[PDB]
Write a protein that binds this ligand. Structure first.
Ligand code: SF4
Ligand code: SF4
Ligand code: FES
Lengths: 616, 617
């Protein structure tokens, strides 16, 4: 009850305890209270002269490092881990398009040639409009790979940012030069006896996160649309009720659409769908970011977010989990073992001990994904009928709101959206990026903050876990306009869109940057002048901090529900919470109270409205 | 009590001088952090997300909040440890590519290509067309491209990897270990260690091996070869060691860190007539520290003031007029210790920023003017030195240095066949590259020198890099006359060649020379590196770069001994994989032994075993 706000989670948690199955909430209590030095960030294991803990003797490390350097180093490596997670996903997308471009990817094509030509033209490919698509693709592959090289002075997509913003980064030393390069430079700087200035460390951490948002994640988003289709607005369902008792239930979990879109195509094969075991159909449901993206591009229903993954298996109806990499809890392998579920992994980078590994690459995806769906149809026969309990009834959601889709709904230009903001019908925009964290009652903060913002005529752009949260709350449909303020509801009914726009997965947060950059460029101001905000009310992962860091560094005020492990240095904390405002035009806000967070987000939005000479 | 800190009299005098002056040393701070955190020492702590942090216990706390066990958690921490060290070398190599490209474009005043012959040879080796006869700047530019591509994401294997025997390359490929890109493997390691990605301890150790190979065969190797191209390939030469290199009558500039791009330009500025005339001092004195000092010693014969733990004690002498630092292994306490005196602590790299220092950023386009400004800062500081607080402890010791692979082969008449013949006869029973640092957990240089003395006594030639250079040098082991401390066979070889029984091959980056030498001997014999009577030791290691070095040695076939254990004892599976499992996979393994004599037995035992596998006595 205190663990989650959802009845489907409640039913599955009670089912888990009766079956003696330990959940992520059960293990969170074992690790609470946690280590104070680890919680403060005042611990360092970067060499075997240590480990060192800073006290308040023990003021410095053995090498002489103070709490400032130690805390900043840990935080840069935290960000580097998150940027690395997106970086590799984007590299994987580059490899796939090259396989298509070279004609070495059976079942893969370029779904959105129009976007390919536009992106290629945008990044400087000559005659991208009229040359053969595979050549245009190959040239774009080269540009992207160069951003994963070490000879650029700035990443390709950075030109989307307003000039004032690009000039600021260059002056500050923040211009991201290469995706992998900045990750390595961060790891270099955090080695003993290298960067021992907390400001320089935070600057490069900002540089590293910008290499994600304007590099790794952005390449990942745009190539995904090129290969799998650009999302259009569409209807679907959410919650554990997406699982059908009468169908073979395949759950795609992780991030890579290269796999999940091939799992979907294999289930649509005539020979596979024919398989014969008491199967009414082959039901595919989404999890995590690969589910978000399958929802965006295919309308496939989503079973749940981060904390719903273990409870999805406990239902007794998950026949298989097809996983790749990132945010896939290893406990899934043990819980699936308690049932019949075949836990299948597909990435060479995402290995789990005890799993069934069927490695998927573009050259063998069609045959391997077809083999995987047969493993699931086999597992559907061994499912115990006694231990099945699908809790809830699914909820309708609308999804597929890319920037392409938003502009289409606005008639082609951002001016109607702009005009609504100048009038005050839409007072501002807040991108909510949150995850789930067992330290917070599940989706309470996410849904509460979302409800507050739309009540104040502030449009919410949702990605990641908040998608399942707002969707379960009925906020992802046009009819949710009745829960928004008069001005925002007026806009939404005019556009036929919900007051919360689902823009995709964690990688797709680059869409929010692209949108902010477009509005800033259209108006001739910096992103730090737009009435925008970002929130991660229930974040947990390195990727969330990398996202939060690149939002702040791009001019977007960013709220965090839980603090990072940096409180052990008040200097680092003050830089993140206040000092960054003077440097990059935005800052971090830490607030566990979602209502106070709405006040803080709205206050900044109001302030930027006044700087534009507008009424709030 | 300070006699237990170091084995050297210059260190003793400075530690006792530090105690009287109330200056806290790295040894004083080591005792404050002992006993350390047990979970951190075991590796059973994880801070990779804010669902945690998590500690594993030995029924609660068996797993992390995400479900991760001690195996995954310990392996993740160790992979990130390796990634930090590879990252340190990676960026140094990237800096040298940037420098050669500046030379190649004519945008680097004072920089030239010292070794055109090596440039043409390296370019030809990596596939540059007509590298032998085309203009040097074009040859350089084409080589710059090859190196940058190894810092890209489109190669299937790094360029220098072809030096390895085919059998070794086939093994890496089968295992999934082939390093594809320098930065790529670092990022992939960080990706794998994110929550919910690689949760298989075997896969994690494999990629850590892949990442370290991207260093030794990539970052460090590019760093070594381009450095020789730009600053000269080391030839054997004489020099002095210890704190006595500092002259009371001269302006004392200490270069500390790693980048020769700066230190070789600091040396040239001191040789300028106006700068040398500006110095009321008797001379301008440049001395080496850490790895940049190793490299100035190798290529210029510049004396070295001391190793890792001697850096703070160098300032306490009261004679260090300036410290020119860049990045890596430069303790931030140096800024506070220098503040107690007149010393100007100068930093030059954008990547190595220290709070409170005098920052004069050095890049190839402005090095000549900036380094000239830095030497003037030091000449200014020479006037502000208090004569009362100066006490230079010891008298310097003669050393011989400059043993690159080029130098070794030259001493052998051009081919490794004489070196090979001595090994088949048994005059040289094997080779051990000692890579150690210093660690306040061990009496300074005790284990290093003790192991070195034991090995040469058993006819085992020692190849020294890094800190052990100052260690063996202070012990009189770096001169031809040190043959009297070796066995009959090894002493016999050394007298024939006129070389010491311990060969100084450079800095930590220069450990790639040892790989190049092993690869050459293995290729010449038609066997794997795992078939050679070779070993590696880091008796007093501490840093991420040392663990990356040890990991890439093990992964290339070289048995590697560590004096102190890494933070992995919390998982017996990871420990057994490092200590035994790797032997079945890569033909070599880690050996953990704090007793240097037992370490010599362990190193010699493996050497003996590989001699038998080659059919030798
Ligand atoms: S880098 Fe410094 S603070 Fe960190 S463990 Fe090593 S000695 Fe301690
Ligand atoms: S990644 Fe897993 S083990 Fe590490 S802190 Fe997070 S929940 Fe704990
Ligand atoms: S566990 Fe070692 S400090 Fe937190």
């Amino acid at each position: 009850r205190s663990r989650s706000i959802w009845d489907d989670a409640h039913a599955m948690l009670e089912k888990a305890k009766a079956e003696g199955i330990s959940t992520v909430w059960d293990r969170a209590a074992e690790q609470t209270p946690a280590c104070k030095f680890c919680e403060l960030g005042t611990t360092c294991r970067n060499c075997i002269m240590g480990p060192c803990r800073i006290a308040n003797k023990m003021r410095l490390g053995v090498c002489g490092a103070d709490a400032d350097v130690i805390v900043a180093r840990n935080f840069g490596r935290f960000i580097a881990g998150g940027a690395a997670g997106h970086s590799d996903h984007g590299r994987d997308l580059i490899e796939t398009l090259e396989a298509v471009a070279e004609g070495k990817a059976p079942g893969y094509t370029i779904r959105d040639v129009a976007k390919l030509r536009r992106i290629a033209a945008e990044l400087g490919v000559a005659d991208a409009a009229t040359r053969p698509a595979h050549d245009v693709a190959a040239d774009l592959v080269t540009i992207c790979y160069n951003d994963f090289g070490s000879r650029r002075n700035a990443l390709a997509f950075l030109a989307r940012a307003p000039q004032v913003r690009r000039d600021l980064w260059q002056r500050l030393g923040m211009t991201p030069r290469g995706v992998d390069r900045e990750i390595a430079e961060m790891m270099h700087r955090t080695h003993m006896g290298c960067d021992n200035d907390h400001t320089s460390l935070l600057v490069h951490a900002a540089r590293t996160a910008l290499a994600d948002g304007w590099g790794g994640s952005m390449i990942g988003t745009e190539l995904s649309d090129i290969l799998f289709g650009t999302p259009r607005p569409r209807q679907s369902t959410v919650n554990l009720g997406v699982l059908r008792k009468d169908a073979v239930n395949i759950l795609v979990h992780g991030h890579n659409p290269v796999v999940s879109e091939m799992i979907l195509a294999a289930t649509r094969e005539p020979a596979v769908r024919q398989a014969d075991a008491g199967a009414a159909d082959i039901n595919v449901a989404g999890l995590c970011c690969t589910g978000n993206e399958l929802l965006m591009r295919q309308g496939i229903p989503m079973a749940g977010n981060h904390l719903m993954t273990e409870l999805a298996i406990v239902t007794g109806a998950a026949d298989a989990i097809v996983a790749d990499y990132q945010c896939i809890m290893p406990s899934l392998v043990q819980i699936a073992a308690c049932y019949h579920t075949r836990f299948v992994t597909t990435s060479p980078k995402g290995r789990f001990t005890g799993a069934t590994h069927v490695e998927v690459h573009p050259h063998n995806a069609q045959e391997r994904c077809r083999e995987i769906v047969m493993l699931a149809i086999d597992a559907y026969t061994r499912r115990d009928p006694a231990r099945v309990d699908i809790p809830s009834q699914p909820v309708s959601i609308m999804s597929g709101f890319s920037n392409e889709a938003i502009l289409e709904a606005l008639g082609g230009t951002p001016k109607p959206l702009i005009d609504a903001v100048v009038a005050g019908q839409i007072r501002g925009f807040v991108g909510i990026v949150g995850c789930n964290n067992p330290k917070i009652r599940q989706d309470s903060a996410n849904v509460t903050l979302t409800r507050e913002l739309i009540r104040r005529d502030i449009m919410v752009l949702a990605t990641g876990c908040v998608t399942t949260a707002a969707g379960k709350a009925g906020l992802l449909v046009p009819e949710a306009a009745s829960k928004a303020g008069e001005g925002l509801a007026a806009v939404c009914r005019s556009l036929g869109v919900p007051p919360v726009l689902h823009m995709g997965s964690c990688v797709d947060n680059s869409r929010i940057l692209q949108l902010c950059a477009l509005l800033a460029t259209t108006l001739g101001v910096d992103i730090s002048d737009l009435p925008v905000g970002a929130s991660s009310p229930e974040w947990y992962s390195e990727k969330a901090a990398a996202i939060a860091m690149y939002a702040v560094a791009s001019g977007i005020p960013t709220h965090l529900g839980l603090p990072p492990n940096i409180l052990g240095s008040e200097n680092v904390t003050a830089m993140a919470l206040h000092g960054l405002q003077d440097v990059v035009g935005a800052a971090f806000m830490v607030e566990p109270d979602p209502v106070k967070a709405a006040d803080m987000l709205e206050a900044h939005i109001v302030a930027r409205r006044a700087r534009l000479g507008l009424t709030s």
